[PDB]
Design a protein around this ligand. Structure first.
Ligand SMILES: Oc1ccc(/C(=N\c2ccc(F)cc2)c2ccc(O)cc2O)cc1
Ligand SMILES: Oc1ccc(/C(=N\c2ccc(F)cc2)c2ccc(O)cc2O)cc1
Lengths: 231, 10, 229, 9
């Protein structure tokens, strides 16, 4: 695998370059059906870009197609969510689902059970901002999620790749002037937030399952197949 | 099968 | 505070000393029931919860929190803590889960959750997880799992203190600096899967409650409602 | 609240 031969800098550049674009919602300036409609439409279009982002994550192509499918099926909502909280950082108290779709917790009440998930998302974004999370760190965290979340539901290659990403995270912190104690302390803090992201994803899945059962909004066959993967 | 299969291949 | 003053070794000693006992179940090899097995685990969990609560009191920094916060942290983490304890004592029992010394089950005897617990225990085995590392991880789960749902800042200082402890242990084990950071990440990434198992576990427990074939204790029921509202 | 009581003792 060529991923293991990459230096730290080469690792960072590859991840930064693989970053998907920031998509827009639909242009018209909120009920449950309308809000969930926009979010679902948005998630569906982002899934297409995520899949191509994933193929560009070092080590991911070296996996079998079946393993690629499993990792994405397990992690897709986590990856959308960490993307959401990342671009919501500079907007304290709000969720920037899209540049033209910036929501607050009052909007979360339009749908039911959404408010809880909104507050968690907002908390996580706040945690990122107060940690001064950098874009280099973010892309590392997002790739860790992709390779780790489904890894125990199958492995050695993935763990080698995961190790290489750890080395890259440390490499960035040592470059930012952090001392040895600061380096591993920050590494722990970052990785522990991944546990919360997992929690948010699981609560999110159930809500999307409730939506599919309500028949409320239409969801794409792709989004449905990703959802069924957790059933 | 899965739409995801197709998307990953191309 | 009192936890922010402890050395790494004093931290480890405190945690090791605070460990709960390994409880027995009410299993009977002679007696035969799929629903009865869940009854066994449910009874076991209910008795373990009592010890967990008194264990949590002894976790450095935990008692520094308000009662309302202590309650929240345990409500969120109780199944995670039970599950990581299970995978730990199941380590040297390949392909089996040691719920109790007299209740050792394999997957043939829910299926998905058992498979995940088995993989987690199997992960601990090849990593050769140490007891000192286990007690650190268990306390991290307690303090971290509900921290995002002043008093919050103190918790992060304790968490950082526990990170320093894990690093100190690994350095003592002879790992290079690169190896220390790698192992640290490896351990912490496992907590994501434990979070996941707990989440899946709660949903199944909620299924058992409505089904009503298996009866839940009054505490587990309160612990269960804490994840629905 | 059973959990709260046990924590209090
Ligand atoms: O059908 C869906 C509706 C919403 C979401 C979603 N988030 C939620 C899903 C469920 C829920 F209860 C709350 C938010 C989401 C979408 C895009 C994005 O960039 C980030 C996101 O987090 C995805 C698919
Ligand atoms: O009512 C309950 C039934 C099982 C469990 C449980 N595990 C499960 C919970 C839900 C599920 F779907 C499968 C296993 C468990 C109990 C004790 C222990 O030391 C470790 C454990 O993991 C706890 C309470």
């Amino acid at each position: 695998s060529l991923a293991l031969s990459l230096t730290a800098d080469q690792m960072v550049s590859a991840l930064l370059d693989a970053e998907p674009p920031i998509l827009y919602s639909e242009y018209d300036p909120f009920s449950e059906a309308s809000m969930m409609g926009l979010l679902t439409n948005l998630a569906d279009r982002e899934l297409v870009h995520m899949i191509n982002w994933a193929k560009r994550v070092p080590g991911f192509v070296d996996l079998t197609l079946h393993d690629q499918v499993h990792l994405l099926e397990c992690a897709w909502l986590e990856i959308l969510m960490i993307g959401l909280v990342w671009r919501s950082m500079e907007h304290p108290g709000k969720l920037l689902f899209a540049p033209n779709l910036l929501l607050d917790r009052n909007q979360g009440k339009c749908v039911e059970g959404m408010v809880e998930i909104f507050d968690m998302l907002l908390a996580t974004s706040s945690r990122f901002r107060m940690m001064n999370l950098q874009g280099e760190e973010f892309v590392c965290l997002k790739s860790i999620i992709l390779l780790n979340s489904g890894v125990y539901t199958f492995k050695d290659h993935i763990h080698r790749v995961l190790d290489k990403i750890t080395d890259t995270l440390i490499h960035l912190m040592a470059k930012a002037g952090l001392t040895l104690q600061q380096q591993h302390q920050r590494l722990a803090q970052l990785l522990l937030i991944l546990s919360h992201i997992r929690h948010m994803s699981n609560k999110g899945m159930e809500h999307l399952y409730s939506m599919k059962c309500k028949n409320v909004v239409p969801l794409s066959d792709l989004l449905l197949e990703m959802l069924d993967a957790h059933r | 099968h899965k739409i995801l299969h197709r998307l990953l291949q191309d």
